[PDB]
């Protein structure tokens with residue numbers, strides 16, 4: 455059973471802007487996704503301080519970067535708080551409608567696409583390098599779900615079974631044909647060192 459949803463007009467317009475605007479500095483997508491993973495890990499850590507049973511679904515707090523040259527995918531995995539089905543549908547737990555407006559108002563005031571994360575819509579920078587994004591998530595209070603979108607104004611949500619993750623989120627970037635540099639170990643290392651060198655969780659770059 456697959457449910458299909460329309461993006462709010464402002465988010466569809468943001469995604470169109472990210473896909474169609476000429477902007478060479480695409481590598482910033484990884485900083486944005488690692489930042490989101492770090493925020494999610496902070497949230498489950500904070501909840502666990504008063505309720506240790508919140509970590510029964512996994513005590514390890516980490517971020518994994520997994521490139522797959524055969525599938526042409528780059529996956530960002532974390533063991534953070536994860537998201538409920540309601541969160542996924544409601545713009546992946548964000549205020550993306552007001553965030554998009556604040557980003558647009560900033561772009562007109564002298565901002566560039568690299569400042570997208572300041573407006574709480576950094577996730578959508580994934581569409582700088584991906585033709586499709588799959589978000590697999592598991593929150594302690596809900597079942598495992600898969601969100602997916604190839605932009606075009608809609609996203610899908612379905613239950614995800616067979617590979618239970620315990621708790622957290624997996625962001626699967628199905629890369630554009632001309633963006634395979636983001637599967638290369640030296641390129642990922644370079645971007646992590648440049649933009650995410652002080653993240654407070656272990657970042658493990660998987661090899662093939």
Ligand SMILES: Nc1nc(N)nc(-c2ccccc2Cl)n1
Nearest residue numbers: 490491494536537546548577623
């Ligand atoms: N890694 C991760 N974990 C959560 N909980 N939310 C996010 C998130 C935050 C904002 C927009 C989109 C996503 Cl997928 N990412």
